[PDB]
Amino acid sequence: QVQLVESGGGVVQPGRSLRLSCEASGFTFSNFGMHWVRQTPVKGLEWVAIIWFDGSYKYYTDSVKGRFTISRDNSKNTLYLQMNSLRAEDTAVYYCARARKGQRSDYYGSETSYTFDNWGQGTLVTVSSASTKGPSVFPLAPSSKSTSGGTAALGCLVKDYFPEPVTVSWNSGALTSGVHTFPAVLQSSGLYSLSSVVTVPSSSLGTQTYICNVNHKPSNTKVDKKVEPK
Amino acid sequence: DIQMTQSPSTLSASVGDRVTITCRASQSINGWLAWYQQKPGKAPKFLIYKASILESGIPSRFSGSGSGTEFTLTISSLQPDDFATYYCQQYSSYWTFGQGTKVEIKRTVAAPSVFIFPPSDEQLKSGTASVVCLLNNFYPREAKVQWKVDNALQSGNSQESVTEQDSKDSTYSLSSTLTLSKADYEKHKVYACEVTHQGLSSPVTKSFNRGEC
Amino acid sequence: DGNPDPNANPN
């Protein structure tokens, strides 16, 4: 089975460097051209660079020229992307992919073009001038403004942390029904903010304790927040 | 670069449906069009190349057609594992992709339950005020959410997040946060979130007055 | 136009 296994991503400040690796198995690596491709939620999938089977030729997308180098070591079955002079907009998941004849295998001639077929699992590259910061945890407290019918909503706002991820549970994981933990948003400050809410019977507010348990491992921040009604 | 555009961006479907996704190019690309499938947290998977050739091992319910600037991908009978995002890619000149079409699970219209939360005293003491509006378990995904402060529409000072489609009831939820400085917050009275959705028989406004707490 | 072959063989 064709296998491409990536490594090397992480969180760095702009101007710094990272090197990505992609190790191949299950095919004759030295017979194939290889690519790097990157993906973001806003901009989608963007081709980055290509290298010939023996490294004898290569080329790049305009936005990385002068900063990124693609290389390979056919004795180690490894493809590399050297990423220097990183910018916030290089933030993405980076994939390696194997070049592929985009035509019937038995056809030979002028009407051939090449694309790529098997992709690696991806590695995340995050470039930001933000520095590690733990979250503030604020209550989203239930009231008449957060009741509809016989249901109340309550929650926690986990605000201004970096980098991802945070984990949130409710009542040490005993409360799961009705929980929605939302994907974090990235603020203009470069810090993340997340809300986690749960819907419960309004009759329970007087007697049931609700605690959100927040853990932000990069900052060693661990908080238990009891949320009471207003 | 050759610009690729897909339509629609989100497509709702039920198991057993015939589903077609279209992809247009800004100039002719001959037949050099490929299709990829991606599910959350996984790498794209190669489906079809030269517009209509299935990759070996892809199920035969997939097929593709087209030339020039207009291409389609069809799933003849949608299976449970076909809910995913599909990307077209031209490989006529370098490699550029469409923006993706997400195939989501179709279900009946469901109105959101709407909730608003005032800022906490803890946050206010730190100098800022975040107001949160929650839309819970609704469908379809498109909803109109507006923040109004003493009847002034707020634009540019809120952010929202939408969950993935729920595994149990196929709905969405949405969280929106409006943030002000404490100073601005204390200059106004009425904080309101107004939600319009086809499941609601009227727009729903949830609001509070500062100091009502 | 098409993209050129970057592999060791034309297959």
Q: Structural domain boundaries of chain A? A: 3-127, 136-226
CB atoms within 10 A of CB A24: 24
Residue among A54, A100, A49, A87 nearest A73 (CA)? A54
**Residue C1 contacts B where some CB pair is shorter than 8 Å:** yes
Calculate how close chain B gets to A75, using CA atoms only, in Å. Answer: 26
Residue A81, φ and ψ in degrees, nearest 5: -125, 115
* Direct distance between the N- and C-terminal alpha carbons of chain A, in angstroms, rounded to an integer: 59
> Would you kindly state where each structural domain of chain B is located, as residue ranges?
4-105, 113-209
What is the C-alpha separation between A95 and A27, in angstroms, rounded?
18
3-state secondary structure chain A: CCEEEEECCEEECCCCCEEEEEEEECCCHHHCCEEEEEEECCCEEEEEEEECCCCCCEEECHHHCCCEEEEEECCCCEEEEEECCCCHHHCEEEEEEEEEECCCCCCCCCCCCEEEEEECCCEEEEECCCCCECCEEEEECCCHHHEECCEEEEEEEEEEEECCCCEEEEHHHCCCCCEEECCCEECCCCCEEEEEEEEEEHHHCCCCCCEEEEEEHHHCEEEEEECCCC
Contact between B95 and C1 using a beta-carbon 8 Å cutoff: no
What is the C-alpha separation between A29 and A4, in angstroms, rounded?
10
**DSSP β-bridge partners for residue B114:** B135
A221 contacts A214 by C-beta, under 8 angstroms = yes
- The Cα diameter of chain C in Å comes to 21
Report CA dihedral (A58, A60, A65, A67) to the nearest 10 degrees.
Answer: -70
B118 contacts B191 by C-beta, under 8 angstroms = yes
A102 contacts A115 by C-beta, under 8 angstroms = yes
Q: What is the DSSP string of chain B?
A: ---EEEE-SEEEE-TT--EEEEEEESS--TT-EEEEEE-TTS--EEEEETTTEEPTTS-TTEEEEEETTEEEEEESS--GGG-SEEEEEE-SSS-EE---EEEEE----BPPEEEEEPPPHHHHHTTEEEEEEEEEEEBSS--EEEEEETTEEP-SSEEEEEPPPPTTT--EEEEEEEEEEHHHHTT--EEEEEEE-TTSSS-EEEEEETTT-
Q: What architecture is domain A136-226? A: Sandwich (2.60)
Which chain B residues touch C5 with a CB distance below 8 Å? Answer: none
By Cβ distance, the residue of A103, A145, A183 closest to B116 is A145
Burial class (CB in 10 A: 0-12, 13-18, 19+), A209: exposed
Return the ∠ at Cα B202 (arms to B114 and B129), rounded to 5°.
35
CATH number for B113-209 (one of 2.60.40.10, 1.20.120.1200, 2.30.30.40, 3.40.50.261): it is 2.60.40.10
Residue with tokens 């991606």: B38
Q: Are strands A10-12 and A123-127 parallel, antiparallel or unpaired?
A: parallel
Structure tokens at B150: 């003493």
B111 contacts A197 by C-beta, under 8 angstroms = no
Q: Are strands A151-161 and A192-201 parallel, antiparallel or unpaired?
A: antiparallel
Calculate how close chain B gets to C10, using CA atoms only, in Å. Answer: 16
**Omega into B40 within 30° of 0, i.e. cis?**
no
B162 contacts B176 by C-beta, under 8 angstroms = no
Which chain B residues touch C2 with a CB distance below 8 Å? Answer: 30, 32, 91-93
B72 contacts B20 by C-beta, under 8 angstroms = yes
A79 CB contacts (<8 Å, ≥6 apart)? A21, A22, A23, A24, A34, A36, A51, A70, A71, A72, A96
| Same fold across A3-127 and A136-226 | yes
User: Resolution in A for the shown PDB structure?
Assistant: 1.8
3-state secondary structure B73-112: EEECCCCHHHCCEEEEEECCCCCEECCCEEEEECCCCECC
By what technique were these coordinates determined?
X-ray
Angstrom CA distances, A96 to A3, A5, A39, B137, stand at 11, 9, 11, 38
CATH, range A3-127: 2.60.40.10
B112 contacts B19 by C-beta, under 8 angstroms = no
**Residue B92 contacts A where some CB pair is shorter than 8 Å:** yes
What is the C-alpha separation between B161 and A141, in angstroms, rounded?
19
CB atoms within 10 A of CB A157: 26
Structure tokens at B184: 């601005």
The DSSP symbol for C8 reads S
CATH, range B4-105: 2.60.40.10
What one-letter code names the amino acid at B30?
N
Return the ∠ at Cα B27 (arms to B26 and B32), rounded to 5°.
105
